[PDB]
Design a protein around this ligand. Structure first.
Ligand SMILES: C[C@H](CCC(=O)NCCC[N+](C)(C)C[C@H](O)CS(=O)(=O)O)[C@H]1CC[C@H]2[C@@H]3[C@H](O)C[C@@H]4C[C@H](O)CC[C@]4(C)[C@H]3C[C@H](O)[C@]12C
Ligand SMILES: C[C@H](CCC(=O)NCCC[N+](C)(C)C[C@H](O)CS(=O)(=O)O)[C@H]1CC[C@H]2[C@@H]3[C@H](O)C[C@@H]4C[C@H](O)CC[C@]4(C)[C@H]3C[C@H](O)[C@]12C
Lengths: 556, 50
């Protein structure tokens, strides 16, 4: 028993179901605007569609009752749905509204907290980069590029932290310290590398360079990790390497042969097959050793560096996450203004979200100002740019849109300070434009009208049914062309052999591309003035009527 | 065009006593108990149809 079991019966027991019923018999929930739509459509597959206030006549409701099929899952669907009162929030607006509703407002001091964590993550990863002798090589390579004049002074740095003169001298002393600490490699070298890294902390690289350096170190670590994974894969899977002893002997170094030669000494039969692919495996171990020879430090500090970079990145990512979910409400608040420029609401809020992400990433708390005011600028800029760009069907550059808007504002102003209206000349008056381009921009403003717009109802006529295609040449003209070809073929047949070939070849009559004088002469092997003269003599002699009368009348 | 409510609530939500409602909507027949017997004040018109 429910509040619909008594309805579904009526529906087919009394033929129909008036609106009043399906209105009051609903539970309490999913009353949402037109949530009924789905239950009415299900009830419609049984035969109802009652009119305004339940009329009757009309013995015809069973053809449409049969025209809605046996398969009645719907019945089950409705039952389940209306027997659970899970909010059937179909409209994405509501669900997103709740999703944002979950994250409470991250107050001011929380925001400065997360800003400190972001800064700390970035600084952590920057220190981590400092710590392997293949990152300063490329630094100096592109610094020389910039100084040697193979690059530009603004393509590598955007101001240090505690003038080009100062940068040049610091890189001189960097070169000196670097070379001395590389020579001194043979304990002491680790301390001197630490001191070089501590001086290198001074540098700030252009964002693109920071991305490229993290990417170069990422791809070298990719080579390391892929080589290690493939070596341990080939070993454990082809040599049947017990994975606990794998851990014990292989783990720690992954670079020396001690576990290699202990496993081959282990006397296992797969240990003997180990030579079958010893060349490959040991070549991969050697390549890894060379990679660490250009690393140079060890095989544990690679682990340390990758884990610290991941940790820092994760921290920063999480902080930015916090900020964005806290300011989503701000984004939507700013969105409400632009809703009615022929774009959907949710697209706007998404553009605002992108602007908020950028703002968050570029925000500086040390300036001492509140975050919301700063983010507003990027959210509004992004929203405006997206509405401008994705709005019109025939996309229009943003400056032209701004000019159209300005024109509109001026038009309205003058229309209401003038009474009648502004003529295009008067608009040109208020603008410095040459008055010529005013009408041009006025033309540009027209928003294509919908092809399906209903015409004055002679019912079931739309607009598309009128527009005719001028492309189609009339069948008359095709008959004309056929007659033309026939008459030209007969008059050519009247001509001599070589005159015929001259006229056919100079043009395309009965052949593909038409050959010019020199190529036709080549095909005759006589290429000279005589061939054009033959063309001209044929033309002149065909001027005479009786040969021309057929085409003389054929002119149009 | 909402759900269907019962309707004396309206007629009572203006702060209306049940007794006053009965006095508004129905004439009254008053009986007297005395001598352990019962009598009714008869208006013959009202008997039509019984
Ligand atoms: C939306 C509008 C519907 C008009 C309509 O439905 N009239 C119904 C008129 C009915 N009456 C008054 C004639 C009476 C009936 O005949 C008798 S009864 O009242 O219905 O009983 C559509 C249908 C034809 C469209 C015009 C054409 O594209 C040409 C032109 C293109 C320009 O770029 C923009 C302007 C123009 C004028 C368009 C405007 C607009 O886009 C129109 C009027
Ligand atoms: C909107 C308009 C309806 C006019 C109408 O309904 N008049 C009703 C006139 C009624 N009266 C004045 C004659 C009195 C009658 O006695 C009343 S009654 O009709 O008898 O009820 C229809 C009729 C002619 C149609 C245009 C032509 O195709 C040319 C052109 C083709 C393009 O591809 C699209 C644009 C153009 C401009 C078309 C648009 C549109 O499609 C028009 C204007």
């Amino acid at each position: 028993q429910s509040q619909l079991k008594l309805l579904v019966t009526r529906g087919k027991e009394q033929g129909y179901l008036t609106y009043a019923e399906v209105n009051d018999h609903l539970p309490e929930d999913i009353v949402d605007s037109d949530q009924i739509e789905d239950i009415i459509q299900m009830i419609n597959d049984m035969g109802i569609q009652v009119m305004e206030e339940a009329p009757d006549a009309d013995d015809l409701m069973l053809a449409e009752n049969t025209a809605d099929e046996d398969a009645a899952e719907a019945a089950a669907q409705v039952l389940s749905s209306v027997e659970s009162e899970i909010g059937r929030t179909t409209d994405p607006v509501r669900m997103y509204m709740r999703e944002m509703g979950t994250v409470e407002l991250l107050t001011r001091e929380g925001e400065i907290d997360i800003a400190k964590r972001i800064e700390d993550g970035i600084n952590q990863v920057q220190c981590s980069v400092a710590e392997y002798p293949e990152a300063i090589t490329y630094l100096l390579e592109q610094y020389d590029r910039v100084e040697a004049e193979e690059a530009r002074l603004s393509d590598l740095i955007t101001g240090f932290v505690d003038d080009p003169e100062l940068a040049r001298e610091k890189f001189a002393e960097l070169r000196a310290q670097y070379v001395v600490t590389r020579d001194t490699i043979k304990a002491t070298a680790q301390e001197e590398i630490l001191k070089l890294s501590e001086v290198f902390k001074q540098f700030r690289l252009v964002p693109k360079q920071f991305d490229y350096l993290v990417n170069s170190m990422r791809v070298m670590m990719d080579r390391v990790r892929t080589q290690e994974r493939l070596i341990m894969k080939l070993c454990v899977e082809q040599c049947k390497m017990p994975k606990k002893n794998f851990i014990t002997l292989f783990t720690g170094n992954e670079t020396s042969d001690t576990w290699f030669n202990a496993a081959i000494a282990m006397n296992k039969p797969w240990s003997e097959k180990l030579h079958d692919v010893s060349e490959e495996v040991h070549r991969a171990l050697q390549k890894l050793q060379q990679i660490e020879e250009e690393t140079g430090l060890t095989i544990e500090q690679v682990k340390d560096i990758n884990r610290r970079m991941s940790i820092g990145e994760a921290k920063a990512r999480r902080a930015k996450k916090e900020m964005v979910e806290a300011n989503l409400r701000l984004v939507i608040s700013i969105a409400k203004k632009y809703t009615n420029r022929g774009l959907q609401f949710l697209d706007l809020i998404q553009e605002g979200n992108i602007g908020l992400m950028k703002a968050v990433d570029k925000f500086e708390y040390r300036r001492g100002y509140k975050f919301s005011t700063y983010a507003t600028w990027w959210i509004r800029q992004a929203i405006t740019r997206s509405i401008a760009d994705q709005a019109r069907t025939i996309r229009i550059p943003v400056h032209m849109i701004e000019t159209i808007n300005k024109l509109n504002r001026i038009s309205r102003q003058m229309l209401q300070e003038m009474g009648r209206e502004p003529t295009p000349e008067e608009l040109a008056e208020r603008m410095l434009m040459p008055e010529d381009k005013i009408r041009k921009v006025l033309k540009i403003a027209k928003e294509p009208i919908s092809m399906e717009t209903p015409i004055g109802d002679d019912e079931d006529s739309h607009l598309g049914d009128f527009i005719e295609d001028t492309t189609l040449e009339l069948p008359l003209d095709s008959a004309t062309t056929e007659s033309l070809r026939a008459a030209t073929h007969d008059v050519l047949a009247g001509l001599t052999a070589r005159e015929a070939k001259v006229l056919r070849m100079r043009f395309g009559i009965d052949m593909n591309t038409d050959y010019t004088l020199e190529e036709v002469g080549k095909q005759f092997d006589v290429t000279r003035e005589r061939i054009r003269q033959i063309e001209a003599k044929a033309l002149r002699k065909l001027r005479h009527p009786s040969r021309s009368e057929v085409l003389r009348s054929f002119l149009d | 065009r909402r759900r269907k409510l019962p309707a004396t609530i309206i007629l009572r939500a203006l702060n209306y006593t049940t007794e006053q409602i009965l006095d508004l909507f129905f004439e009254k027949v008053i009986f007297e108990i005395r001598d352990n017997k019962l009598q009714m004040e008869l208006v013959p018109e009202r008997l039509r149809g019984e």
